Amino acid sequence: IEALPTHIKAQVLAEALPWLKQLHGKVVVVKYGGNAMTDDTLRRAFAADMAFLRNCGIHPVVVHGGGPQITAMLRRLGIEGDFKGGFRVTTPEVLDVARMVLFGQVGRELVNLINAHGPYAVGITGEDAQLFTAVRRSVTVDGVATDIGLVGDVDQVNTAAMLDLVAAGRIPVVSTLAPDADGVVHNINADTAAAAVAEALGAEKLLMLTDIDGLYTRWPDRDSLVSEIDTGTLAQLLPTLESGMVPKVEACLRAVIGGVPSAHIIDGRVTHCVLVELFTDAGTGTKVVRG
Amino acid sequence: IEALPTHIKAQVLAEALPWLKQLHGKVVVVKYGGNAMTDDTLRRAFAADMAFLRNCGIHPVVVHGGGPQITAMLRRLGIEGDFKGGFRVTTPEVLDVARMVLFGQVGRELVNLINAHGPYAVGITGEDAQLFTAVRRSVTVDGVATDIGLVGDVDQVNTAAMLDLVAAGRIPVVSTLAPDADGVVHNINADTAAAAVAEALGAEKLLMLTDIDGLYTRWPDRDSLVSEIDTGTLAQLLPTLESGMVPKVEACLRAVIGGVPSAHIIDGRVTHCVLVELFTDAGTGTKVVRG
Amino acid sequence: IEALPTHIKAQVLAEALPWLKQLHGKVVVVKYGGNAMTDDTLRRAFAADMAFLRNCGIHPVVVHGGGPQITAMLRRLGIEGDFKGGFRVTTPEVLDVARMVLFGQVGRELVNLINAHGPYAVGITGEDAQLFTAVRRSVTVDGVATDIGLVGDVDQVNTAAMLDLVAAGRIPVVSTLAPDADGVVHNINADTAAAAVAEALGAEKLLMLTDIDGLYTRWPDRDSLVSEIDTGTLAQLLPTLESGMVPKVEACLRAVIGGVPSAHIIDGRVTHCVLVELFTDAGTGTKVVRG
Amino acid sequence: IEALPTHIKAQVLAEALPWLKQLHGKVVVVKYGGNAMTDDTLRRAFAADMAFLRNCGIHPVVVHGGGPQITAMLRRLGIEGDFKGGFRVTTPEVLDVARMVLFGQVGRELVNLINAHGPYAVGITGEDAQLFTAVRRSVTVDGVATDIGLVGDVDQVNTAAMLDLVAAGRIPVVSTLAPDADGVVHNINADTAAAAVAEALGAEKLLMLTDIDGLYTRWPDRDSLVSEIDTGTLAQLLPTLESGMVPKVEACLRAVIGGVPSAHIIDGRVTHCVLVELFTDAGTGTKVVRG
Amino acid sequence: IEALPTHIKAQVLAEALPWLKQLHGKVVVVKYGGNAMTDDTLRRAFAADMAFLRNCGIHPVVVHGGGPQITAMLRRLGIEGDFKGGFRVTTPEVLDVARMVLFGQVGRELVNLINAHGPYAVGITGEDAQLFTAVRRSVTVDGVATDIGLVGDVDQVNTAAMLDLVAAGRIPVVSTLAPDADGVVHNINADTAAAAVAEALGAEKLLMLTDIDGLYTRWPDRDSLVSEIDTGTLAQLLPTLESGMVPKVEACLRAVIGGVPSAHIIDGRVTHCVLVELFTDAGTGTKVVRG
Amino acid sequence: IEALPTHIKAQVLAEALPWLKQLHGKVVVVKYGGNAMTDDTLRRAFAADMAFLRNCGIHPVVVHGGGPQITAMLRRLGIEGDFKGGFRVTTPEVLDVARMVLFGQVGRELVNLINAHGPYAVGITGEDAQLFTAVRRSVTVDGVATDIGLVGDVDQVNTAAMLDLVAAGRIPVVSTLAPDADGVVHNINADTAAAAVAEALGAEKLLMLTDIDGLYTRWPDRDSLVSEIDTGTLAQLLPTLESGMVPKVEACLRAVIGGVPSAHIIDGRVTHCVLVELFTDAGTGTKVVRG
């Protein structure tokens, strides 16, 4: 990284300035999962980027997933699953495991990585300070939508308390569990919870780290990768995409329709993807705006 | 509770007033473990008492343990232990389990119980916002003090950040894990961590919930239960007590010598023990002051 | 008070918690007169209860009367009265006496009693900082309503200045005198002034200390004492009650219709009546709500 | 006042500017008694001057007396006095009268006069919010100093609470009564209480309204009126002056020695004496500084 | 100024009080030019009056002109002018000169004069902190309105930033230059800029220092000088006045129609004209109100 | 700038993070002159870098020179100079010119350039709000140090007011003129004024833009350019350097000895020199630390 002439290091730094202005003082929600979360080099870069944002006076909020880690813990504990469609039923037992893996293991790693740069990160769920609630969701399994246990969608968000915590300079690292109106804690899909947090906080950008270059119109035609797309066009192509992309795309729609200026699907396999998507025009992600 | 004449309900309420004045605006650290934590009726009463304090403008801080729950999880996961003396060696594997049980299971239950009364509780470890650090401790096993893995004593405490969180009206529920100066997370004995938090925050009282009526000079002589005792006298009798009481008593000494006006050993088997110790002179606990 | 088992002292304390939550941070206006004001034991209990409220983060405002003390001072000064109906005409001379007795004697005693518990109470009239104004009221004497001198109803209240003084932690002790729009000070009936203060400050409760168990439908039928009643029903029975109860009931109507959630007529002959009405369900008072 | 050329109205206004700068944002304690308090034209001018100060961002504090009004009330009430030396013994009965006359009559008139210009004045004694305490004083009667009842000197002053009330824009009008360390209210000489308030608040000036042109070295030699004098010189001539001037001069000494930059003895028989002493060099008063 | 009896110095000071109340805490914009700006004695008096206002808790804002000083500098620099009608075309060269004379010479003198009394004045243009913008204005020259270069009218004003600077206790001294929406700096007529600042800041008064006794209906009939006039009447006589008075009168109309309670045309040849217009009823100026 | 692989744009951005942390919330004083100030491309880059810093929550303070522009204006005005040694005597006439060129021309250009990115810059001298004072300096001309008119060194700095203006988010652009203790304005060398501002504000870095690669031990030996040097070593080589470097080096010594962690001499001929010196390790400047 040293053979690079310094007059060019200068220019890439200077070229960040219009995005520094656009995001100064603003909320950016980042959904973090996939290989950016399981590879050690990408993890440390991700944590360093959160520290970066925060040392620019930008206000990151991290929502994390952890599907595979829950599955591994359930097998270690010998807890046999029930499955309707392709969905595990989350019994009270499974939720306790989900909660202790998400909040007590996965969240901790990111909190510690970020905090290597300063006292920034703090972990939380909807349970803490009543920051958000859940409502039980059913799923559609080849016809009759059905019940699959303590699985929810975000209900209400304590917008005021959340922004107080951010204005105080903290980086909330959110584990997606929250109580319903009766105090019963549900597990919430992390992609959609990111969308709901972004909308409630008036975020400027939703960033969705995913394990793909970006959105493909006609996968796997290479000459079909899009750079930008509107929600209306993104509605009419939703029924066509691979299973893995549906939650990430529904999140971007639910956010951008909800007033978030842009949602982005970026590649988490790229080192410092966040820095390149926010401060560079050479990003590989795809940007969703309204229309 | 209705056959009680109302002129007497009045008097017990009025008799709380001098302790309301003494504790208004003040920090009270409560170590919470034992049967007050495992029995459902005592749990709900404990949570309701934390809500009480907080609706009197008193500032509770809860430090919780969970030794037995860690042990059960380790057996469920089939993780065989190593033991020096009577101490389990906490390998990196054991700490990950300890942390996920303490923060992701035991802390969650108390947060949810308290939050049934309002948005008060928030869970945290030393990892969050760098609130406190640990330093590795060795243990003395019948002679040569020795190493037993990632087990620590509290090092430094971010007093300012902690009191900000309390002045904001929150009830921190602390899980005793914290990073050392190198970012490596240790498990801290909860009794001694309570003592260190109390001293750092300038608490007015340390409350230590324990499964005994109180301190016995000469157990099991009944006519030996003390009501109050000074630290100097409490130093010279320390080498004489049952194994279970040593950490609770060392905590009270380390706190009261450190400037906390009084530490109390109260019985957690009593419903609403906190209310009776703080707002009543008919408490069964034993109070430690300096001298 | 010591032969009472401690597990029962606990329960009556715990049973206060839902009213602590309901009133935390809220304004409670208390009209204080009668035998709770002239008996020494009831006085000290009343003052101690105001200190209690204030050490729970509740915000009491005390409005006091003093009819009989004015009369005694007038006789001591040999000032002969004029009477239309049953009403003394308050000449400029009588008002100067009323003001100096109410503010300079009766208010002082309560300020001093309360302040024995801390720097809480501060005395005031509408004259101070222009906190409220009066408008001259006429009275109805068996037909033609007529003039009886410098006697008023509360006009406007400086809501902002009043709540600043309360948020500062003070317990205003109000003597009901205020200037009209021309600077001429009037004496205001204390019961109705309490109602107007409660409505202006957005109080949660109006407490009216009176020398009776509570409201009787058909006095003196014992089996006619009510526990709760709505304003509409309380309008249609108003023309039926003893002379002494009319101002206390008109106050509760004017307050509850004005948005105060509940007004209460409680017995000031009961030691710590305030504590039992606020923090106990075994109260003897009668509660007025809208409907 | 109209035949005066306007170029000269201009100059006297401009000539106030260096005292506006000196006193902007500062505390001025004014002892107010005598004929400035009993003549209606001088009263209204005094009140208007307090409003003036306050509309210049200056912070007046008024301490008032009222000796003669107490005496008249005692005679109206037929309360016979006891006298040691020339001093009335203030029994509990006399104090109740003193307090109700000072706070409930004399203070009220000034509060109302000032408040004709805005919501500025608020009345208070040491009893309110524990603003100051008294300590019982004995007197020297031709030899053996002796006890004369509930008469005190100011003990401690709640400097913080007092300046909060002033920074809030209020003009405290102080009646000199305060409780001792046991809650027993004493009457304090107003001249000396003014001196103690001035010293406690870090006032810039003490103003002492008195019924004389100013200090005379050798009364009644006309060519003996002084314009300025230091405390050391003012100590050595104290044993020589008329009885009426001793309390006013002891006040100025106790204040200026206590750090108040200057104390002034001005003539309260002069309309707007305060304005002329503060904003004009043509004052008739006498100024005391240290040395 | 000493042969004046002191009882009369008192009365003129006391007679200022109702204007102190009216303007306490309020914004007063002062247009300053003409002989009050070029004569040394009038300059120092003007600066002293700004200090006066500020030491009364009044908030002056000074807008200054400087037409003749620009002309002299242009001749010193040998820059030949172009003239359409009677108007100099302000080329880029002329504006650089105008800006450096207005901000770098004329503004500096007033800043320094005022600051002799304290740290009050601070100089600024629309360029600083984007405090206001300009829009290019054309002029009407005996028919076809035409372009005369970089000359503007005030466009938008950063009301919030301006009042922050004033609430901080500063006296802004404004040089009328500001950028247009494209960053190109224009010179703004000072009289009309004063009117726009007054309206944007919600000033209580606009003061326009001019070199005349006041407005004459039928100049030069002496018996035609007016003391007060409404905007409607001031519209219909505008087409009749001398060239020099049109900008001063258009300013007063644009301000008073814009909600400023009164605009005043006062004589800047009078020492301390500001003090006499604000704090005296013997002013020679003419007051404009709406109607 | 597009043929650069994006994984490398990422790394140079990520490599800025440790200097973002070091300077977040801190003061950086930048002396700005020379060719970075006269070339249009370097000007716009400089202004953009100030906007950059400010959108990272860093607090730049710009001190500017302008020697050559003063000289040109003096010749345009035909003002003949007097010279002792190589120094122009600054008469009152020369200072008025210096002040109007520095504040009214050179400062304006930078204010406008920076403000193209937002409302950040505000121009000021020591005259404004009494922000700093000067003391007359003499010079040493081949022996006898002598007087050269109204030329000064910075005396006192209003540290509090200056940091208020910066905490408010403003970028002060300072023109080095200030009054002495008698109100007489002096011109201050900009290099040394930068050093004094840096020391007074507790800056983290002093940046000195100069027209050279950096400090040469033995100019013009190329193999003599230093990267870092301590003050003690920088004292003993000071008597050896070219005339142009002495003020820049004396500034760095006076700053670093005064507690500023590092002063830097960087090349203003390099586009975005500020960005490369602060956020890159490939800088060409030379850093001065204490020792």
Ligand SMILES: N#Cc1c[nH]c2ccccc12
């Ligand atoms: N709200 C909230 C919080 C939950 N955990 C925390 C740790 C430090 C500061 C704040 C919070």
Ligand SMILES: N#Cc1c[nH]c2ccccc12
């Ligand atoms: N407002 C008001 C007050 C009237 N008297 C007082 C005494 C202490 C504090 C505040 C006030």
Ligand SMILES: N#Cc1c[nH]c2ccccc12
């Ligand atoms: N806004 C603004 C300012 C422009 N110059 C200033 C000098 C001192 C304080 C504030 C400002």
